[PDB]
């Protein structure tokens, strides 16, 4: 009782090529579903659509989420990370849960009274065989809060399974978490485990200083030839085939080694409202994929630059991670209440998401048939393509669990971060059934690896700076009410590398 | 663009010798290096390589919000800063302070 | 801003200067002091700041 089961650790040590970021928060776990595994479906909300159908179970267990970056990295550490380094990746994960406290609430007439419960336990288990469904990878809410002084609430755990409409099928699996061995903690006991990330490639934080089509030497002609003129001059029977040397004078027609990455086109919407037609096109005009009779919006999709150079206003409809500003409502908030992230860096090696991939020939030419081409709205992988993955943000997720299949291509998840077949295991928790709730201290510690910046660039880099101009309250800090706020999304790519 | 060191005039005393245009006041600065062409119309040419080893003091601070850092602008200028124009003329556009990171008083 | 300045020649007459052996010396750059009050940046101390020059800058006036 009177012996503390742990301490408070919250600092990042910078040692050589590795970073050690410890995060410790305080939590409050209520009792969900009154200790019941319950079925849920769309008919509870009515399921107005077929695309919205879901059939699943909701369990009393809660689960911890550190899966977003700003849990671990203070905005300063993140600056020191994005400025000086070309890449990073998690190595170790070390988790502790301690200083458990159990409080009972017995309502009597007006006031509710809250007293200790000494003999009560808190059941915790982590799935290290990954036999449960994995809900940590969808960018759900409920992660550890960014600011260390906050107190957060463990989100309820529930999962989904196969469905036709709201009905089940014979294959639908029902997992009872009580079937797993778990550990039980009283106020003096504490819980700890340690993890080791599987090998993942570095996340590359940098923006190329060369565009895929400018790789050439500007002073020297190629020895390849291209077809410059198909006619000498106006008239009948005037066709000719004339070849020229590929050189700086006509640069774009040179032969090249590699081609930009894939594209699946998105609609483009203008931050300026008056540049859009008066029609509802949010759902109807959105690029989406179809699975088993359901239409699923494509978000964000492949990594593609958001806009052509010079256009800040246009953004791909569903193709850009959008974050909320502090204190933004849930439903139909105006366009300046949310933060939009733009893929400016990927344009060099990646196509613009609102533009075509290119053109191809739609027929054979002849004297009777002109050359006819038509646009390419989507292009699968072709050998030789190079591309940049999607950027990760301070607010964005870290990892996902690769779906378990026979095959996949480039498992790196489309919302950013490190795709893994064995991510950090879920941590599930509940109160032991005897109104009761428990609190404690979560401490997560991750060890990161860093790829240092070797560049010989003579002129100074672009760095992430905090504007000096005076204002009513500092960025990334509390306000007079005490409400912590993150002004703008932060990308990881501020440095440069040769293509 | 400024100086590195300056020699402290050898005197009875001084107060805070650090020189006024900046840098490191020293009583035995790096020696002068004198050169001439031995008389025998004559001139000579060659290479000079100079190497100084600098020591650093790292930023340990616990400040939560981000620092003010020095950066390079991104607004499509005719020529990049700290680089050459079409005549091969290396131009330093603005002087750069050393003071960006923050400490407590 | 040229017009906030007095309409006279105060370049050497009005400047700060330490005197040595009957020979007046301008105080450049001077002791270490902030160049201006916060919020006003147009002004600068007369000799109190290292003044470099951009390339191509002439040697006079």
């Amino acid at each position, epitope marked *: 009782v009177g012996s503390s089961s742990g301490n408070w650790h919250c600092d990042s040590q910078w040692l050589g090529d590795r970073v050690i970021t410890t995060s410790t928060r305080t939590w409050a776990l209520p009792t969900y579903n009154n200790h019941l595994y319950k079925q849920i479906s769309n008919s509870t909300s009515g399921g107005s659509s077929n695309d919205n159908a879901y059939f699943g179970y909701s369990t009393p267990w809660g689960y911890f989420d550190f899966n977003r970056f700003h849990c671990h990295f203070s905005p300063r550490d993140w600056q020191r990370l994005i400025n000086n380094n070309w890449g990073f990746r998690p190595k170790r994960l070390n988790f502790k849960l301690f200083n458990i406290q159990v409080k009972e609430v017995t309502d009597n007439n007006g006031v509710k009274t809250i007293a200790n419960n000494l003999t009560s336990t808190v059941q915790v288990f982590t799935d290290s065989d990954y036999q449960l469904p994995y809900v940590l990878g969808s960018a759900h809410e409920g992660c550890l809060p960014p600011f260390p002084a906050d107190v957060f609430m463990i989100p309820q755990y529930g999962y989904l399974t196969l469905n036709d409409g709201s009905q089940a099928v014979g294959r639908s699996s029902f997992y009872c978490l009580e079937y797993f061995p778990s550990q039980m903690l009283r106020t003096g006991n504490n819980f700890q485990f340690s993890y080791e990330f599987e090998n993942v490639p570095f996340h590359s934080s940098y923006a190329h200083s060369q565009s895929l089509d400018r790789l050439m030497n500007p002073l020297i002609d190629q020895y390849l030839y291209y077809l410059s003129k198909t006619i000498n001059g106006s008239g009948q029977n005037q066709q000719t085939l004339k070849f020229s040397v590929a050189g700086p004078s006509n640069m774009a027609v040179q032969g090249r080694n590699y081609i930009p990455g894939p594209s699946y086109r998105q609609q483009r919407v203008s931050t300026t409202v008056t540049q859009n037609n008066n029609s509802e096109f949010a759902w109807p005009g959105a690029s989406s994929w179809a699975l088993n009779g359901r239409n699923s919006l494509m978000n964000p999709g492949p990594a593609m630059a958001s806009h052509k150079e010079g256009e800040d206003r246009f953004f791909p409809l569903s193709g850009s991670l959008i974050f909320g500003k502090q204190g933004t409502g849930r439903d139909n908030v105006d366009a300046d209440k949310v933060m939009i992230t733009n893929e400016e860096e990927i344009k060099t090696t990646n196509p613009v998401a609102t533009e075509s991939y290119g053109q191809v020939a739609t027929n054979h030419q002849s004297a009777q048939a002109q050359a006819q081409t038509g646009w390419v709205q989507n292009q699968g992988i072709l050998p030789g393509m190079v591309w940049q993955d999607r950027d990760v943000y301070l607010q964005g997720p870290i990892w996902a669990k690769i779906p378990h299949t026979d095959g996949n291509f480039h498992p790196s998840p489309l919302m950013g971060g490190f795709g893994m077949k064995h991510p950090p295991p879920q941590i599930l928790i509940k109160n032991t059934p005897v109104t009761q709730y428990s609190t404690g201290q979560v401490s997560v510690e991750i060890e990161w690896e860093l790829q240092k910046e070797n560049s010989k660039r003579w002129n100074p880099e672009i760095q992430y700076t905090s504007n000096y101009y005076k204002s009513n309250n500092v960025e990334f800090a509390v306000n007079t009410e005490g409400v912590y706020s993150e002004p703008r999304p932060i990308g990881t790519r501020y440095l440069t590398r040769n293509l | 663009q400024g100086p590195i060191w300056a020699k402290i005039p050898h005197t009875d005393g001084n107060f805070h010798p650090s020189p006024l245009m900046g840098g490191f006041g020293m009583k035995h600065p790096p020696p002068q290096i004198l050169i001439k062409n031995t008389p025998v119309t004559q001139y000579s040419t060659g290479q000079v390589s100079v190497e100084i080893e600098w020591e650093l003091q790292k930023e340990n601070s616990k400040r939560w919000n981000p620092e003010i850092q020095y950066t390079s602008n991104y607004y499509k*200028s005719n020529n990049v*800063e700290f680089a050459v124009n079409t005549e091969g003329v290396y131009s330093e556009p603005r002087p750069i302070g050393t003071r960006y990171l923050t400490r407590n008083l | 801003t040229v017009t906030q300045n007095n309409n006279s020649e105060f370049a050497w007459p009005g400047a700060s200067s330490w005197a040595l052996n009957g020979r007046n010396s301008l105080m450049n750059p001077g002791p270490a002091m902030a160049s201006h009050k916060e919020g006003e940046d147009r002004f600068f101390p007369l000799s109190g700041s290292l003044i470099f020059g951009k390339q191509g800058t002439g040697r006079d006036n």
Partner: antibody
Amino acid sequence: QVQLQESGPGLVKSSETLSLTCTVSGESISSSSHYWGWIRQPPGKGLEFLGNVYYLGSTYYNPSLESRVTILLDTSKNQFSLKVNSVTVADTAVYYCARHGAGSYSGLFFDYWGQGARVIVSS
Amino acid sequence: DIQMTQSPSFVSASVGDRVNITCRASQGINSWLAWYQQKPGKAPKLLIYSASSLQSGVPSRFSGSGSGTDFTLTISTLQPEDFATYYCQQANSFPYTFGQGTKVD
């Protein structure tokens, strides 16, 4: 050559803040060492100075305007923004951006001018 | 503030005929002036800076010499290309003030 473009809303509700921005192409505000300033032309009338902003961020405002105007200097994107508060029907005209300086006459005469920006304050 | 009054408010003078526009500062401006030219709807463009110094872009025809309380812009050999209002500006003391306008025909 210095080209100056203004952008922002062309209609603002009365007692709503007005915001324009001038993105200067052809120079670099941080290293040009010139003053940048605004003036306004109420229709069919003489232009009246609003204020200017020196490249280090210092700012002068016109006392006639009573502490409404605020000129922010965003040096990295190479543009500076005018913001005037509690707009009224009277405060509607074409707002010109200008480079306030030259070698001899810096922060005095306006040599290079914006294309102009119409703003109509209305209810 | 310092008032500025251009004496002709509307001067109708046709092609070839010499024109002179005069604007008097309320108080001595120590020969700091700036005549401008505004063709309808476009932004004005500078013509004469200080007292008599012509701008690089402007044609030799424009000229003017102020005595410091009195100023004149003489458009000599007026060509049809310019029929526009003309403003003057004080540089002497804040706030800078553009008096009225002189519309020429």
